[PDB]
């Protein structure tokens, strides 16, 4: 399953720049299904839980604008679910948070909780690969 690009989130981490590429693949499948009502409320409980399946790709190194090196992670969700997300700030903020949170655990350790989302760039890497 080769992920198709979505958006890109710049953040930092004590040792320097970290970019998370949020992609999507039709084959994941979603946490089907729920609307804004239920899940704005079930974060307060439900878990664990918890749904939102996402693949968290290995790190890969890439160059930034100034030519200094930095780290990039690719996170994939369901395409159908991704489209839900894209016209909803809250859900977007959620996915980013789960993405940073689940990454911190898998790879260790610190990540900036606070972030920025790029505007004109959908992905930093290539992008790879993954786990067909």
């Amino acid at each position: 399953i080769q992920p198709k690009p979505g958006f890109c989130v710049k953040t930092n981490s004590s040792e320097g720049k970290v970019f998370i590429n949020i992609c999507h693949s039709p084959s994941i499948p979603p946490p089907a299904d729920v609307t804004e009502d239920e899940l704005l409320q079930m974060l307060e409980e439900d878990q664990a839980g918890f749904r939102i399946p996402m693949s968290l790709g290995e790190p890969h190194a890439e160059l930034d604008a100034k030519g200094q090196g930095c780290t990039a992670y690719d996170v994939a969700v369901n395409s159908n679910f991704y489209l839900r997300m894209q016209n909803s700030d809250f859900l977007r903020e959620l996915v980013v948070t789960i993405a940073r949170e689940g990454l911190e655990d898998k790879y260790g350790l610190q990540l900036n909780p606070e972030w920025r989302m790029l505007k004109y760039r959908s992905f930093l890497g290539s992008i790879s690969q993954q786990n067909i």
């Binding site: 710049k10 930034d64 100034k66 920025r116 790029l118 505007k119 760039r121 930093l124």
Partner: peptide, 8 residues
């Protein structure tokens, strides 16, 4: 304006 990583 913008971030240092796109394409005051």
């Amino acid at each position: 304006e913008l971030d240092s990583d796109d394409e005051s």
